[PDB]
Ligand binder design. Structure first.
Ligand code: HEC
Ligand code: HEC
Ligand SMILES: [Ca+2]
Ligand SMILES: [Ca+2]
Ligand SMILES: [Ca+2]
Ligand SMILES: [Cu+2]
Lengths: 106, 106
């Protein structure tokens, strides 16, 4: 599961959550996203391939995933309570977490 | 203040953070946005003036500001720490969040 596969998994499950019909289906997609993010966090992006692994830039990159994961966890709390709509809206605001790391690192 | 003035505070102080040279300027600008975000959170926006205060439509409106304040706080830490270029880049990233709430209720 290389980084590009993890990104597709994130991308694919956003679509799943948008057309989901109950909070349990959003929960399932959010959990798959959450593991794809933690798996993605392990990797090194191409835009930093020759920088040092312990660099400030690799830690900034790794922290972008903690910011995304914490949004996923906030959405998971709504899904687990059955608030399908509110959790669907939550998953929509993940888009900015995707973008904030994308600018400087994609 | 009313919602529009708070928004003016948010919009002008973003540009100020963009043009500031030192950390005391970013911090001062970030602090005004924080109070304006928390004050705007209490308002009802026109495009929702006929719904009811505990709808998932206006749950979403208030939660947008908790998330905005959280990122202003990330930027304030960096400023307080003296990383002007990093606080300036934290603050530029708020606009994705601005535009997301805007797409819905502006
Ligand atoms: C950093 C902390 C990131 C976060 C959060 C998200 N993404 Fe990402 N994404 C990132 C990088 C460095 C890259 C490039 C990797 C490469 O090998 O080029 C990507 C790429 C994508 C892609 C395209 C993948 C490809 O085929 O090259 C997609 C579709 C994508 N990212 C989607 C996506 C979504 C939906 C996110 C939030 C839910 C998201 N990413 C977060 C880095 C980071
Ligand atoms: C919801 C959670 C919002 C967030 C986050 C931000 N804004 Fe906003 N904004 C919101 C509404 C409902 C409105 C319309 C209010 C109205 O009475 O029309 C706005 C409007 C603005 C405007 C226009 C102000 C005007 O001239 O009438 C500006 C310039 C603006 N907002 C800026 C702005 C910025 C820079 C933000 C984040 C950094 C931001 N807003 C966040 C709702 C929400
Ligand atoms: Ca690539
Ligand atoms: Ca459907
Ligand atoms: Ca106006
Ligand atoms: Cu965020």
């Amino acid at each position: 599961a290389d980084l590009e596969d993890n990104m597709e998994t994130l991308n694919d499950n956003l679509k799943v959550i948008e057309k989901a019909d109950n909070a349990a289906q959003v929960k399932d997609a959010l959990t798959k996203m959450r593991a794809a993010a933690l798996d993605a966090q392990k990797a090194t992006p191409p835009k930093l391939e020759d920088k040092s692994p312990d660099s400030p830039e690799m830690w900034h990159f790794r922290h972008g995933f903690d910011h995304l994961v914490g949004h996923i966890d906030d959405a998971l709390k709504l899904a687990n309570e059955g608030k399908v709509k509110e959790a669907q809206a939550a998953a929509e605001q993940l888009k900015c977490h995707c973008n904030h790391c994308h600018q400087h690192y994609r």
